[PDB]
Design a protein around this ligand. Sequence first.
Ligand SMILES: OC[C@H]1O[C@@H](O[C@H]2[C@H](O)[C@@H](O)[C@H](O)O[C@@H]2CO)[C@H](O)[C@@H](O)[C@@H]1O
Length: 582
Amino acid sequence: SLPREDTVYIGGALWGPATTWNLYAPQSTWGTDQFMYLPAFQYDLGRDAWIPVIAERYEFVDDKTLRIYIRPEARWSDGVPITADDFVYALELTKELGIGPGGGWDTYIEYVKAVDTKVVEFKAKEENLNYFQFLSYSLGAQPMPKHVYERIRAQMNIKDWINDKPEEQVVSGPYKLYYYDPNIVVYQRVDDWWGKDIFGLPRPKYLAHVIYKDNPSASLAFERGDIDWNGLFIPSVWELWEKKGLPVGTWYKKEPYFIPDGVGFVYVNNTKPGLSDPAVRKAIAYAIPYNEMLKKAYFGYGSQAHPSMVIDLFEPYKQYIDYELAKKTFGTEDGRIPFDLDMANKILDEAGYKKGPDGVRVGPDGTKLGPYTISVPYGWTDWMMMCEMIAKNLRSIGIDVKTEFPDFSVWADRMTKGTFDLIISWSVGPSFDHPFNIYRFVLDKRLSKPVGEVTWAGDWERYDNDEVVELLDKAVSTLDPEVRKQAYFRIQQIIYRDMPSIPAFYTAHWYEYSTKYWINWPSEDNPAWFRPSPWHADAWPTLFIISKKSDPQPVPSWLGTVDEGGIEIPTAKIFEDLQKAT
Ligand SMILES: OC[C@H]1O[C@@H](O[C@H]2[C@H](O)[C@@H](O)[C@H](O)O[C@@H]2CO)[C@H](O)[C@@H](O)[C@@H]1O
């Protein structure tokens, strides 16, 4: 019963049921992090700059001490000021509970301290000084409402709290929950949002997400005009406007249609017998039919990933790849891993795996290579097809793998708790600290948890290597790019030796829009925000950029770097200030 012209309908972001609106719970509902809880500074990948959001300003006291000045206007939706205590509390709670925003901060941050009501100070750890992580955890810090969470902690386990009462929801963002049921989640704009005199208001009054069971049903809704903002895999997407003449668009009008999101992996659980052998993981890498699955399953919307984990779609990242090592190791022109079942079988043969009567390999200890599952969420039809193609090839070489596609919530539980065998999942994307970010997320045991315990922070596969930890600790102890590069090069040697999990393809930043009710969507022709996908962590500025068709507004004046006429601080300026404070 929502007003259509004041509602943005969304697809491809929420899969399975609503769970909670609590970032410390094992699962929370799409929209919670994106729109309800904002950071100190919002990183802008498109401009390589930082929007001062809850923060007004930063200051380096020295190269290891960063003060963040909170806007006087920054205020929770219940009227309580956002204070330095809220920043300290959020991070200390994440450390205590082993889950929540800012996971891992305490590895590279010595302290977070409320030096005044509106001033928070972060101090870098010097033992393993890491300037990227220092900046990431400090500038990107997300406060959480201490006064709310302490009340909850007195009543119950914070992990059990649903936070599902609209009137009582205490948020820092411009939206909060309005309504939900088994078929929809709806958010409503906070009209007296604290940021209204700095950022304006987002244009939609409501954000609604009907819960579709699969891609085909979501696609049908999109074709009917019932989804405005979509983050969906869509086969033959160009035909929506070329053949069907629908008022629909993507970032690119021509192929590949989508900008890149990150790196999709075949994650292989290192804790399971058989899968714990690097030889088996290497064999799996050679048995993935990269080219065929990316054409048939992925419609050419993304290409094969480089095994270094570096996103070589961007020229400036190519310096971080030891191409000679990759070429030497894999025998291909660029060092990508070839699809080669002969090689996969050879690897298993040379590791002492012999096929038994049923055709399944048994190791020299003799661990049987199966039964295993490969799993992705039901309805994610592109990934499901990839899984089927991969599983069949693995069965061919004597690894007993079958597909299993449970509801998203169940899949996510098994991934985060590390009870899976194989899955396809995401990792990280292009960023100011790439490829440090992907090595940290995928390879760092410190971000993992025991099997049975939830981690959203990293290392789902439970890879355990102490040399990687040492290399991550030294990679950015100075800003000399050569030190970083050599750390990355050695990590790459370790990746090829251990095959902790398999970088497979560059994931698409799924993003489609309808112009029927909402206009000025970011695109190649209007590149106002480079992370517009409705499920992306950094989606929120999109909602300030779009207008109602019947009420067009100008571009928000705060957008753009300081030199361009907005309020965004270039990453280069932050590093300039850091070096100057040394
Ligand atoms: O391509 C697989 C699948 O992706 C779905 O979007 C995912 C996205 O790929 C993932 O990185 C992010 O963390 O979650 C979103 C969903 O919130 C997309 O909705 C599907 O159509 C697609 O099959």
